[PDB]
Design a protein around this ligand. Sequence first.
Ligand code: 1FL
Ligand code: 1FL
Ligand code: CA
Ligand code: CA
Ligand code: CA
Ligand code: CA
Lengths: 115, 115, 115, 115
Amino acid sequence: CPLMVKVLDAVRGSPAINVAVHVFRKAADDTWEPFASGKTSESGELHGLTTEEEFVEGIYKVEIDTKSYWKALGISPFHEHAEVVFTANDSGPRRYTIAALLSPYSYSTTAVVTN
Amino acid sequence: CPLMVKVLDAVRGSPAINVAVHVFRKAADDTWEPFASGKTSESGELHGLTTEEEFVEGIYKVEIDTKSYWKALGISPFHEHAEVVFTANDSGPRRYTIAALLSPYSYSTTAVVTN
Amino acid sequence: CPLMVKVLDAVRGSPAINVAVHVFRKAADDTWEPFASGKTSESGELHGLTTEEEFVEGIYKVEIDTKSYWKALGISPFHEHAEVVFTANDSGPRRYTIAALLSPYSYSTTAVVTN
Amino acid sequence: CPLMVKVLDAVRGSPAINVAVHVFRKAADDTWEPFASGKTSESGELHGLTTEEEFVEGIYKVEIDTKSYWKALGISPFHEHAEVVFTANDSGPRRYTIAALLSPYSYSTTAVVTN
Ligand SMILES: O=C(O)c1cc(-c2ccc(F)cc2F)ccc1O
Ligand SMILES: O=C(O)c1cc(-c2ccc(F)cc2F)ccc1O
Ligand SMILES: [Ca+2]
Ligand SMILES: [Ca+2]
Ligand SMILES: [Ca+2]
Ligand SMILES: [Ca+2]
């Protein structure tokens, strides 16, 4: 699968499980159309978001519902969500992993692009 | 100064200078109203975005134009921008520092909220 | 395997491959004795460092040779290495993943502890 | 002030106050000589560690006592400390800011080097 998401919890030192993730693609009219979504597994990973045929070049937005994650744990969060926006460009075979590390008042995200 | 933004460059180990920052506020009709904008200084800091009177309760979006930053350095970056979304002043006025650390394929953001 | 290391490159958006990793355990005389070592694979992962029988409770040090990594890429690094020091404590079945995200002037590390 | 340290708490979104910081310098006999130490202030900043005259070229180690910080907050953290090791002033005197962002199972560190 060409697009995978991984979410970690920096407070409990664990995968962030059951985190809702929504993927949008930028449309011609510059609005965000829903493209794919899911929830992270017990490993904190979300697989099977899309397929190679559907994942074309374009501008994508990945919204991670961090606020619901923290509220389910009884921990007070700062952000409404974590939003990752990027251009996917074919430059040879590419697989994208979007990884996020979450704290109540901070998040880090990084992209791992492999052949 | 109720809202301040600080941006660092993890590649060169320096302040990220002249980074454009745009602040939006969610309006009654659920759209993003432009609220304030500016550029980081030579210290990587952006002061004077707003005032105590203007910075009311609401949902705010801080969009840091990381892509233009890297491209001005001749680097093709992964993200379009770094976007921080949060509810402000829900329990009275606070002072918010939004700090961002930038790499071409990664960023971290953190919030410092003081009374 | 009870202890795994994963290293990512925030500049190129990729696994950090062929990164030397050394594990030390704190000895009775408070000196660091060599315990295990290896190099990250093409996925940026180092498996097979130790076994369940050998990985007892104690204070461990994980040294990641970030400086050699950056020098092999022709990129100017700040740190001599990335060093992660922690106490491993049996509290039920535990597997430890030490993950590191590298930039020339910054690194992040996090621990993922799972059952 | 050639060497400054700043520490933030990613859980509470605040400066990490009263964090002990110890600086060592690698000696001729390849041991770590104690060089300077202090505690972060109410702003999370530690100033006045050393002087321009005392901060000569060398390999330095900044050990941030994160464990005592979390334990004073009643939290059992993963790391013993956060340790930053770097060669300083190799091409003349520089000003170094060592910034650290803390979570119970994670930390990030970054260096800001200015002339
Ligand atoms: O920016 C982040 O979200 C991040 C992600 C990782 C990470 C990435 C991929 C993976 F398979 C495991 C990880 F811990 C490791 C460190 C890190 O800061
Ligand atoms: O998440 C981030 O954006 C981040 C921020 C800092 C940091 C905090 C305070 C400061 F004055 C400068 C900084 F880089 C240090 C590390 C880091 O990952
Ligand atoms: Ca193209
Ligand atoms: Ca209110
Ligand atoms: Ca025990
Ligand atoms: Ca010299």
